Amino acid sequence: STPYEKAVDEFIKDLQKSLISSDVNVKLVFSLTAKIKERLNKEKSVLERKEWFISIVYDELSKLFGGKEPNVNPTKLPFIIMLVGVQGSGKTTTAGKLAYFYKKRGYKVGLVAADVYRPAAYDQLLQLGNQIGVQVYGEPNNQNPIEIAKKGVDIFVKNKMDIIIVDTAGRHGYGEETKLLEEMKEMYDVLKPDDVILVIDASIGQKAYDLASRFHQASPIGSVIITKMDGTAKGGGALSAVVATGATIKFIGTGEKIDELETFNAKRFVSRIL
Amino acid sequence: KYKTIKEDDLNDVIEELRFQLLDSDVSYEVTEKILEDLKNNLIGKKVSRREEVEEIVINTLKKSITEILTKNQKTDLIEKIRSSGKKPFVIIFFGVNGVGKTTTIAKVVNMLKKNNLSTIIAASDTFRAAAQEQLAYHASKLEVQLIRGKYGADPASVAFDAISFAKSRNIDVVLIDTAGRMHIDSDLVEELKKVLRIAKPDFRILILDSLAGSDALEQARHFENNVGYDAVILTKVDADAKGGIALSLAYELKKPVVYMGVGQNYDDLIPFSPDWFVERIFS
Numbered sequence: 001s002t003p004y005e006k007a008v009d010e011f012i013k014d015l016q017k018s019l020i021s022s023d024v025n026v027k028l029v030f031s032l033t034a035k036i037k038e039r040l041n042k043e044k045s046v047l048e049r050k051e052w053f054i055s056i057v058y059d060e061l062s063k064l065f066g067g068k069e070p071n072v073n074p075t076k077l078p079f080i081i082m083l084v085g086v087q088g089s090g091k092t093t094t095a096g097k098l099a100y101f102y103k104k105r106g107y108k109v110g111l112v113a114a115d116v117y118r119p120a121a122y123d124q125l126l127q128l129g130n131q132i133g134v135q136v137y138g139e140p141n142n143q144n145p146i147e148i149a150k151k152g153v154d155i156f157v158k159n160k161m162d163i164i165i166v167d168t169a170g171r172h173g174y175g176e177e178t179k180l181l182e183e184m185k186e187m188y189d190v191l192k193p194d195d196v197i198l199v200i201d202a203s204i205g206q207k208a209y210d211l212a213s214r215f216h217q218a219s220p221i222g223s224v225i226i227t228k229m230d231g232t233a234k235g236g237g238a239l240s241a242v243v244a245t246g247a248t249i250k251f252i253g254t255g256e257k258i259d260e261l262e263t264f265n266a267k268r269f270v271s272r273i274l
Numbered sequence: 275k276y277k278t279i280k281e282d283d284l285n286d287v288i289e290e291l292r293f294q295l296l297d298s299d300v301s302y303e304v305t306e307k308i309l310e311d312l313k314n315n316l317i318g319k320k321v322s323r324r325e326e327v328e329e330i331v332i333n334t335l336k337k338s339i340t341e342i343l344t345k346n347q348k349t350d351l352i353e354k355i356r357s358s359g360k361k362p363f364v365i366i367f368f369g370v371n372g373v374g375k376t377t378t379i380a381k382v383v384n385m386l387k388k389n390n391l392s393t394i395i396a397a398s399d400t401f402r403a404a405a406q407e408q409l410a411y412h413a414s415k416l417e418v419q420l421i422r423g424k425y426g427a428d429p430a431s432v433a434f435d436a437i438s439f440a441k442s443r444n445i446d447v448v449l450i451d452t453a454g455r456m457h458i459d460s461d462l463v464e465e466l467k468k469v470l471r472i473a474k475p476d477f478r479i480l481i482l483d484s485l486a487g488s489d490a491l492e493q494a495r496h497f498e499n500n501v502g503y504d505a506v507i508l509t510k511v512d513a514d515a516k517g518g519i520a521l522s523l524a525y526e527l528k529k530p531v532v533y534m535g536v537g538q539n540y541d542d543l544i545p546f547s548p549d550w551f552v553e554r555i556f557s
């Protein structure tokens with residue numbers, strides 16, 4: 001066992017603990033670190049250089065979700081966004097934050113309240129819309145969320161909105177809620193959105209990979225927004241969700257206020273995860 | 275006749291157990307301590323020759339986890355309320371954003387109604403969009419009184435009015451909803467402490483999301499240090515979540531989980547049992 005080989009091994013062992021402690025999916029940590037270990041042994045007489053080791057970690061981790069700064073301005077207009085995610089993850093609030101972000105940039109924005117399950121879901125999004133001056137479409141008496149979604153999109157397209165953002169009910173997709181995944185798929189098929197955004201709580205633990213995978217199989221995830229980054233969570237579970245879907249992380253949420261949304265920064269996020 | 279357990283006998287099974295606990299969202303640091311406890315309890319112990327070391331290890335762990343949780347159990351909450359001479363018995367619910375406070379309050383109302391206890395709800399989240407409307411829907415469906423407070427009232431004023439109202443009507447229980455807040459948000463932690471000083475609750479419940487990883491323990495630690503609470507309710511266990519936070523809470527903080535939320539309907543609340551937890555994790 002060469003002094004270098006020993007150095008690599010201890011570094012990889014410490015990195016495994018660090019990533020797991022930050023809530024990256026355990027199996028993922030081992031496969032990721034296996035690739036990193038292989039690189040450290042093949043690339044660069046010399047002994048351990050931690051600085052080079054770390055650079056390879058940042059490199060392999062950055063690959064794991066894209067280097068490029070996210071593009072957050074819509075490709076074509078009108079641009080339909082459908083927000084999805086686990087109960088309480090921050091979807092309704094993030095819809096308001098997104099509407100605010102784009103309005104500030106000079107877009108005509110419409111919000112669609114397509115959650116018919118949560119009490120006062122409509123009232124919540126209407127209040128956010130009222131606060132930031134963005135029109136909200138909803139039908140509090142309608143129990144068909146797809147019909148609301150479609151009618152809302154159609155009206156906003158007709159009236160030449162640039163960006164249309166559809167809020168949907170919370171779901172996790174397990175047990176009875178497998179049917180909610182089917183409903184999400186159906187909404188996806190009907191709206192044909194331009195971006196399906198998985199909105200995910202930064203604090204999410206070891207279920208993240210399998211849960212995000214279930215979502216992706218039902219309706220392909222294009223983008224991810226990580227909420228509650230103003231908290232103490234490292235965010236490794238959110239990283240796991242991103243790897244399961246192949247999606248691009250575009251924004252993080254940094255508070256409850258409507259302006260507390262910012263573009264995702266890969267380097268800082270790696271540093272946060274550690 | 276009996277073989278002596280050595281460290282080398284334990285290595286393979288300790289690693290399988292480590293990954294099982296980690297997968298169950300028992301945090302890394304707690305998992306390590308528990309397994310170190312396990313190894314130390316077993317190194318030097320005798321065992322029959324045709325007995326499988328691996329099984330004794332697994333059973334010793336299941337038994338230790340069961341004891342850690344069983345020792346932390348307190349009196350049942352309904353029995354606590356019934357035995358209390360206080361009217362109303364005042365309960366407050368707090369925790370970080372989106373974990374499930376408001377919905378859990380509705381389930382608790384439902385459970386209290388089934389136990390023939392009268393209840394009113396204080397709508398003391400006066401910040402978040404539609405927070406009072408959301409509770410008003412549940413209050414109406416559960417047919418219980420919601421106290422919204424005067425127009426523009428702050429959380430403490432709403433709670434004060436709710437308690438005053440319950441006193442004069444001899445209502446058994448007041449349940450106080452509060453806005454989501456980060457455990458590291460000093461201003462909002464102060465807002466909560468202000469409601470506590472004014473409401474002087476008889477029971478304080480932290481809500482934790484069972485889908486949360488290691489941060490759930492961090493939430494629990496910080497809130498215990500800055501605020502203090504009596505018990506935890508874990509939500510969203512129906513998302514195929516193991517709820518390993520339950521073990522970490524007992525092991526690190528000596529705090530019990532009293533109920534678990536297992537869906538979005540009012541009946542979706544079960545009491546916490548050590549045996550149930552151990553079966554979930556190891557089966």
Ligand SMILES: Nc1nc2c(ncn2[C@@H]2O[C@H](COP(=O)(O)OP(=O)(O)NP(=O)(O)O)[C@@H](O)[C@H]2O)c(=O)[nH]1
Pocket residue numbers: 085086087088089090091092093094115118168169170171227228229230252253254255256260371372402454456
């Ligand atoms: N501190 C903080 N709070 C946030 C952030 N994003 C959302 N929230 C808060 O998180 C809570 C849940 O938000 P909400 O929009 O209702 O989430 P949701 O996913 O629509 N819930 P549901 O699944 O029930 O429809 C709210 O208290 C909201 O203010 C964030 O970045 N930071």
Ligand SMILES: Nc1nc2c(ncn2[C@@H]2O[C@H](COP(=O)(O)OP(=O)(O)NP(=O)(O)O)[C@@H](O)[C@H]2O)c(=O)[nH]1
Pocket residue numbers: 087088118170172370371372373374375376377378399402452453454455509510511512513534535536537538542
């Ligand atoms: N599947 C499932 N969903 C749950 C459970 N408990 C709560 N929820 C859902 O989680 C979402 C958030 O619940 P809510 O009561 O608004 O949480 P909150 O902590 O009061 N949010 P806020 O911080 O904004 O006030 C809702 O969709 C609610 O129905 C549970 O046990 N299982």
Ligand SMILES: Nc1nc2c(ncn2[C@@H]2O[C@H](COP(=O)(O)O)[C@@H](O)[C@H]2O)c(=O)[nH]1
Pocket residue numbers: 115116117118119120121122123140141411415
């Ligand atoms: N009990 C009851 N709830 C209803 C009915 N129609 C809609 N809801 C509830 O209204 C809510 C959706 O409308 P709002 O977003 O406007 O609250 C959901 O909680 C839904 O269950 C009904 O006929 N009866």
Ligand SMILES: [Mg+2]
Pocket residue numbers: 091092093115118121167168169170
């Ligand atoms: Mg919502």
Ligand SMILES: [Mg+2]
Pocket residue numbers: 375376377399405451452453454
């Ligand atoms: Mg609430």
